[PDB]
Design a protein around this motif. Structure first.
Motif, PDB file in Angstrom:
ATOM      1  N   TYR A  90      44.703  43.690  27.888  1.00 37.15           N
ATOM      2  CA  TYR A  90      44.606  43.330  26.468  1.00 37.15           C
ATOM      3  C   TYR A  90      45.771  42.312  26.277  1.00 37.15           C
ATOM      4  O   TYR A  90      46.728  42.154  26.783  1.00 37.15           O
ATOM      5  CB  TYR A  90      44.925  44.687  25.694  1.00 37.15           C
ATOM      6  N   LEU A 138      48.811  40.331  24.229  1.00 41.14           N
ATOM      7  CA  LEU A 138      49.977  40.858  23.695  1.00 41.14           C
ATOM      8  C   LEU A 138      50.669  39.585  22.654  1.00 41.14           C
ATOM      9  O   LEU A 138      51.261  40.219  21.817  1.00 41.14           O
ATOM     10  CB  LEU A 138      51.028  41.025  24.643  1.00 41.14           C
ATOM     11  N   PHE A 139      50.279  38.568  22.896  1.00 41.61           N
ATOM     12  CA  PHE A 139      50.996  37.316  22.300  1.00 41.61           C
ATOM     13  C   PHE A 139      49.819  36.422  22.022  1.00 41.61           C
ATOM     14  O   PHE A 139      48.962  36.068  22.664  1.00 41.61           O
ATOM     15  CB  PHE A 139      52.297  36.651  23.064  1.00 41.61           C
ATOM     16  N   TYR A 189      52.054  31.584  26.836  1.00 40.07           N
ATOM     17  CA  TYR A 189      52.578  31.288  25.277  1.00 40.07           C
ATOM     18  C   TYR A 189      54.109  30.868  25.014  1.00 40.07           C
ATOM     19  O   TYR A 189      55.040  31.807  25.664  1.00 40.07           O
ATOM     20  CB  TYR A 189      52.470  32.987  24.770  1.00 40.07           C
ATOM     21  N   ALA A 207      57.397  30.267  23.502  1.00 42.85           N
ATOM     22  CA  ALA A 207      58.210  30.659  22.305  1.00 42.85           C
ATOM     23  C   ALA A 207      59.381  29.963  22.361  1.00 42.85           C
ATOM     24  O   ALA A 207      60.186  30.225  20.995  1.00 42.85           O
ATOM     25  CB  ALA A 207      58.590  32.235  22.889  1.00 42.85           C
ATOM     26  N   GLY A 208      60.098  29.285  23.296  1.00 40.91           N
ATOM     27  CA  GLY A 208      61.126  28.127  23.051  1.00 40.91           C
ATOM     28  C   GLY A 208      60.879  26.912  22.570  1.00 40.91           C
ATOM     29  O   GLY A 208      59.846  26.450  22.677  1.00 40.91           O
ATOM     30  N   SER A 236      61.799  31.204  31.601  1.00 38.27           N
ATOM     31  CA  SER A 236      62.534  31.510  30.526  1.00 38.27           C
ATOM     32  C   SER A 236      61.637  31.179  29.225  1.00 38.27           C
ATOM     33  O   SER A 236      61.087  29.977  29.135  1.00 38.27           O
ATOM     34  CB  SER A 236      63.872  30.739  30.438  1.00 38.27           C
ATOM     35  N   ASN A 237      61.577  32.052  28.343  1.00 38.03           N
ATOM     36  CA  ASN A 237      60.775  31.805  27.140  1.00 38.03           C
ATOM     37  C   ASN A 237      59.463  31.266  27.300  1.00 38.03           C
ATOM     38  O   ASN A 237      58.799  30.604  26.480  1.00 38.03           O
ATOM     39  CB  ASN A 237      61.309  31.015  26.089  1.00 38.03           C
ATOM     40  N   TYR A 289      55.725  33.365  28.758  1.00 38.25           N
ATOM     41  CA  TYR A 289      55.466  34.436  29.210  1.00 38.25           C
ATOM     42  C   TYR A 289      53.703  34.339  29.142  1.00 38.25           C
ATOM     43  O   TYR A 289      52.951  33.687  28.436  1.00 38.25           O
ATOM     44  CB  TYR A 289      55.548  35.586  28.096  1.00 38.25           C
ATOM     45  N   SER A 290      52.923  35.037  30.305  1.00 43.28           N
ATOM     46  CA  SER A 290      51.578  35.077  30.144  1.00 43.28           C
ATOM     47  C   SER A 290      50.901  36.248  29.028  1.00 43.28           C
ATOM     48  O   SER A 290      51.750  37.269  28.610  1.00 43.28           O
ATOM     49  CB  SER A 290      51.264  35.893  31.299  1.00 43.28           C
ATOM     50  N   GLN A 348      48.362  41.178  29.330  1.00 46.33           N
ATOM     51  CA  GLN A 348      49.017  42.167  30.165  1.00 46.33           C
ATOM     52  C   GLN A 348      48.151  43.539  30.208  1.00 46.33           C
ATOM     53  O   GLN A 348      47.343  43.856  29.488  1.00 46.33           O
ATOM     54  CB  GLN A 348      50.016  42.580  29.422  1.00 46.33           C
TER      55      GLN A 348
END
Ligand SMILES: *[C@@H]1O[C@H](CO)[C@@H](O[C@@H]2O[C@H](CO)[C@@H](O[C@@H]3O[C@H](CO[C@H]4O[C@H](CO)[C@@H](O)[C@H](O)[C@@H]4O)[C@@H](O)[C@H](O[C@H]4O[C@H](CO)[C@@H](O)[C@H](O)[C@@H]4O)[C@@H]3O)[C@H](O)[C@H]2NC(C)=O)[C@H](O)[C@H]1NC(C)=O
Ligand SMILES: *[C@@H]1O[C@H](CO)[C@@H](O[C@@H]2O[C@H](CO)[C@@H](O[C@@H]3O[C@H](CO)[C@@H](O)[C@H](O)[C@@H]3O)[C@H](O)[C@H]2NC(C)=O)[C@H](O)[C@H]1NC(C)=O
Ligand SMILES: *[C@@H]1O[C@H](CO)[C@@H](O[C@@H]2O[C@H](CO)[C@@H](O)[C@H](O)[C@H]2NC(C)=O)[C@H](O)[C@H]1NC(C)=O
Ligand SMILES: *[C@@H]1O[C@H](CO)[C@@H](O[C@@H]2O[C@H](CO)[C@@H](O)[C@H](O)[C@H]2NC(C)=O)[C@H](O)[C@H]1NC(C)=O
Ligand SMILES: *[C@@H]1O[C@H](CO)[C@@H](O)[C@H](O)[C@H]1NC(C)=O
Ligand SMILES: *[C@@H]1O[C@H](CO)[C@@H](O)[C@H](O)[C@H]1NC(C)=O
Ligand SMILES: *[C@@H]1O[C@H](CO)[C@@H](O)[C@H](O)[C@H]1NC(C)=O
Lengths: 596, 195
Positions: B122, B124-125, B142, B144-145, B155-156, B158-159, B162
């Motif tokens: 599913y 998550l981001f 995804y 984020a930074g 770092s910052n 992410y897949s 999940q």
């Protein structure tokens, strides 16, 4: 975007990963504890290694986010927990040395055996025979021999290891921002970032000292009475104004005074409150006992167990080839899986232990909605206090009559009440000075005020001073008596019991007042009230999100520990002790030494 | 009555895929009998919004759509109009005027193994919210930074997808549940699906 959101995303990912890893590790641990095999040992080792590693890399990655940019006061708490509990600052050689020292200490304490006097034929272990000898044997010489031999053979090996260990721990603490390992331990109760609820690491010592100063007179009166009874028991050895010999406290170290009830019963002729025969007559079993406990828990309005708990929890001794540790435990594997491990017999002790463990299970269930890093008690005392209040409430004659085990014709009066109060006192009051002394000595040695050459001299000096117990045999600095304790040898904090002792009585008084109870506090039942349960659940559901000071205010309307509930609880025994101490001088003499 | 609308394929399928990629089946040109649904195990949540359950056979529509996926036990309440939460606003979003019924029953015995399940993923981001009745399969890092992820993790970075985890010993609320959603609608065309 902002540091707060960047940290929120990281916490969101970590929350999901940690639950799975922790569940796997806990399942492996439960499998080993219910099934002792080498394959299970290997499975536990692998799971623990994976969990510890994962925590290490997560803590290492969490260092990127500074704390001063966060104002949610919750993400800050979670990040601080991760950093604190996963960071290491020691070199590889120092870490290996520390781990080796800890493993050697644990192995020595576990496998330490003493041999029969002046004989190499047989050697005995602590738990099987030494505990029984200290509990029951009345032989002065045998008790003295066991005490001396055990303490020497355990401390003389572990003294230099303890020196190296305290050196390494002080180095690690000074590498961290804390002043020393004592400050590191005391930092648990610290509360910062909130106005009107802040707590300081140095205030704990002052509060503990103030509470002990207020509690002293009850302990001194009880000590005088116990000294009189022990003089009646053993005539020759005891001195009228001196301290009690250490080896005649009914146990190995003097932590509890429960074993002295047979000698110090006030009114022996009165029947004792025992329901083992009644349970045998009614043909009770473990499932019935647990169902009764669950019904009592339901009666206050709390939710009860799911089907998985009954299906998976083991409540009987397996026997045969299946061998498991029989120490009662409450397991929280997470992800909605709650289990209880206990080898159960048909006794009132196990009947009360059922309630005691069920309290911890309910507390664990209460905060299931909180995040992973907040699924824990407010501090180290709340969990134990919650576990113990239910055992306190479940021993009442009113509850025993309501269940039906106790005969309705039973009557209560002077001597039943006084015997029950004294039996409770011998277990509760006695341990407090010992705990306070142990924690104070550990704090002093970690601070560095007491040098190594004077460790033992100071130890026995405050033994004569505070607890009023004098050593039977002189000892030099070669011995290590404090290392003979399990908690001291295995690096566990010890002030949690002192905090729990006050917390449980404060909670009990609050609940009894909420339930509109009248009469003496020691006869109180909360089974049928639904408001005390509501208040208790309201406190339970919080978890670690709110400060423990705020939780304590929400419960009892106070922001600090107090001893007045305990004094009110034990006042009826206090008056009788004052009456009985008319002809006995109150107070011990430090100059007395039993070895001339 | 010859062409029975067959529902024992959308049910009773031994494979319900993942929630982030949910199947859609169009039912038309057949006689629909809803009595076959009640022939299965007791349903955890049988909620009908726009039509009375007793009168499902007395009214009929142009087309009927069936969607199936598997979610956790405690996110069932989120499959409903007006609800807010991860699964509802990132994997399957319902409209306000939804007309139909929501079906959900436990499948712990069928969709769990002791070793662990990792075939039910599913999301998550996501950069933005989901419009009603939308599907996304794109799998990208995804970011984020501020510094671009450059298509790598770390770092910052992410897949987005999940996976769940299902064991037979999980408590209620974490066990897998199978969900089937039925939709009814109108348009300027003969209905021709009822009987
Ligand atoms: C951060 O990392 C730290 C490690 O540094 C973790 O801290 C541990 O936290 C756990 C959870 O509180 C502590 O577990 C407690 O251990 C006590 C020690 O008991 C020992 O002795 C008994 C025999 O008397 C043995 O059976 C036992 O196995 C131990 O060897 C227990 O007594 C505690 O149990 C209490 O509660 C249960 C109910 O759950 C009661 O039934 C018991 O009677 C008892 O009252 C408890 O299990 C552990 O000690 C901590 N470690 C250290 C070194 O202090 C954190 O968990 C971690 N935080 C995370 C990951 O978020
Ligand atoms: C600090 O950050 C946390 C984490 O976001 C904030 O908690 C969040 O608070 C909002 C509003 O109270 C919650 O929204 C609610 O979501 C539920 C569905 O989960 C929905 O049904 C409600 O109608 C509401 O929209 C949000 O869930 C909650 N987040 C978490 C993880 O609990 C908190 O508000 C922040 N504190 C400050 C002071 O900014
Ligand atoms: C207690 O432990 C033993 C050994 O770990 C278990 O025996 C194993 O059982 C599994 C599956 O039942 C087999 O795959 C292993 O080959 C067995 N190992 C051995 C050495 O026999 C035993 O089943 C466990 N008992 C319980 C009740 O779980
Ligand atoms: C809580 O309520 C229950 C049921 O209303 C009480 O249980 C009864 O207790 C009396 C003794 O006072 C027995 O004679 C009855 O047989 C019990 N009935 C049942 C159904 O258990 C219970 O006593 C109440 N609790 C308290 C503390 O009074
Ligand atoms: C407690 O368990 C019983 C079954 O043993 C159940 O009937 C009852 O509803 C449970 N209590 C509550 C509050 O649900
Ligand atoms: C026992 O109870 C009676 C009740 O009249 C009282 O007179 C007496 O003083 C009590 N004794 C003690 C030791 O409390
Ligand atoms: C589907 O139905 C068939 C026959 O109706 C049956 O054999 C099979 O076990 C069912 N499978 C599931 C997952 O319900």
């Amino acid at each position: 975007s902002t540091i707060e959101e960047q940290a929120k995303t990281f916490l969101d990912k970590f929350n999901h990963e940690a639950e799975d890893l922790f569940y796997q590790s806990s399942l492996a641990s439960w499998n080993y504890n219910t099934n002792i095999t080498e394959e299970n040992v290997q499975n536990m080792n692998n799971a623990g290694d994976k969990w510890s590693a994962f925590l290490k890399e997560q803590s290492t990655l969490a260092q990127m986010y500074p704390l001063q940019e966060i104002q949610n006061l919750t993400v800050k708490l979670q990040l601080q927990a991760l950093q604190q509990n996963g960071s290491s600052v020691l070199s590889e050689d120092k870490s290996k040395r520390l781990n080796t020292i800890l493993n050697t200490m644990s192995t020595i304490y576990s496998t330490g055996k003493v041999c029969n006097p002046d004989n190499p034929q047989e050697c005995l272990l602590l738990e099987p025979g030494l505990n029984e000898i200290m509990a029951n044997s009345l032989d002065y010489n045998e008790r003295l021999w066991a005490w001396e031999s055990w303490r020497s053979e355990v401390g003389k090996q572990l003294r230099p290891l303890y020196e190296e260990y305290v050196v390494l721990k002080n180095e690690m603490a000074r590498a961290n921002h804390y002043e020393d390992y004592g400050d590191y331990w005391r930092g648990d109760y610290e509360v910062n970032g909130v106005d009107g609820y802040d707590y300081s690491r140095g205030q704990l010592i002052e509060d503990v000292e103030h509470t002990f100063e207020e509690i002293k007179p009850l302990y001194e009166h009880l000590h005088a009475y116990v000294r009189a009874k022990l003089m009646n028991a053993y005539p020759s050895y005891i001195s009228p104004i001196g301290c009690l010999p250490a080896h005649l406290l009914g146990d190995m170290w003097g932590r509890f005074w429960t074993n002295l009830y047979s000698l110090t019963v006030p009114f022996g002729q009165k029947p004792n409150i025992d329901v083992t025969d009644a349970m045998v007559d009614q043909a009770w079993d473990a499932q019935r006992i647990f169902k009764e406990a669950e019904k009592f828990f339901v009666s206050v309005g709390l939710p009860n167990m799911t089907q998985g708990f009954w299906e998976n929890s083991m409540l009987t001794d397996p026997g045969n080839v299946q061998k498991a540790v029989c120490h009662p435990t409450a397991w929280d594997l997470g992800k909605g899986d709650f289990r209880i491990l206990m080898c159960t017999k048909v006794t009132m002790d196990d009947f009360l232990t059922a309630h005691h463990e069920m309290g911890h299970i309910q507390y664990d269930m209460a905060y299931a909605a909180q995040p992973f890093l907040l699924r824990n008690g407010a501090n180290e005392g709340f969990h134990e206090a919650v576990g113990e209040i239910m055992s306190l409430s479940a021993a009442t004659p009113k509850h025993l009559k309501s269940i039906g085990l106790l005969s309705p014709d039973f009557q209560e009066d002077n001597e039943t009440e006084i015997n029950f109060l004294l039996k409770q006192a011998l277990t509760i009051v006695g341990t407090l000075p010992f705990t306070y002394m142990l924690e104070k000595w550990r704090w002093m040695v970690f601070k560095g005020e007491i040098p190594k050459d004077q460790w033992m001299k100071k130890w026995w000096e405050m033994k004569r001073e505070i607890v009023g117990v004098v050593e039977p045999v002189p000892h030099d600095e070669t011995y290590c008596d404090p290392a003979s304790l399990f908690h001291v040898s295995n690096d566990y904090s010890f002030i949690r019991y002192y905090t729990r002792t006050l917390y449980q009585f404060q909670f009990q008084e609050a609940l009894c007042q909420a339930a509109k109870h009248e009469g003496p506090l020691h006869k109180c039942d909360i089974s049928n009230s639904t408001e005390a349960g509501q208040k208790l659940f309201n406190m339970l559901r919080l978890g670690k999100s709110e400060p423990w000071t705020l939780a304590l205010e929400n419960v009892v309307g106070a922001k600090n520990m107090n001893v007045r509930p305990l004094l009110n609880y034990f006042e009826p025994l206090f008056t009788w002790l004052k009456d009985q101490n008319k002809n006995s001088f109150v107070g011990w003499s430090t100059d007395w030494s039993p070895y001339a | 009555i010859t062409n029975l609308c067959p529902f024992h394929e959308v049910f009773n399928a031994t494979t319900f895929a993942s929630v982030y990629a949910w199947n859609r089946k169009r039912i038309s040109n057949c006689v629909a009998d809803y009595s076959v649904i009640y022939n299965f195990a007791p349903f955890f949540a049988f909620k009908c919004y726009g039509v009375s359950p007793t009168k499902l056979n007395d009214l009929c529509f142009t087309n009927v759509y069936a969607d199936s996926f598997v979610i956790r036990g405690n996110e069932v309440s989120q499959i409903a109009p007006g609800q807010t939460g991860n699964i509802a606003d990132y994997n399957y979003k319902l409209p306000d005027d939804f007309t139909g019924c929501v079906i959900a029953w436990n499948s712990n015995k069928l969709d769990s193994k002791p070793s662990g399940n990792y075939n039910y993923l599913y999301r998550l981001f996501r950069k933005s919210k989901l419009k009603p009745f939308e599907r996304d399969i794109s799998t990208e890092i995804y970011q984020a930074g501020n510094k671009p992820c450059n298509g790598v993790a770390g770092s910052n970075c992410y897949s987005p997808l999940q996976s769940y985890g299902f064991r037979p010993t999980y408590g209620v609320g974490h066990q897998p549940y199978r969900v089937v959603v039925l939709s009814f609608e109108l348009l300027h065309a003969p209905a021709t699906v009822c009987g």
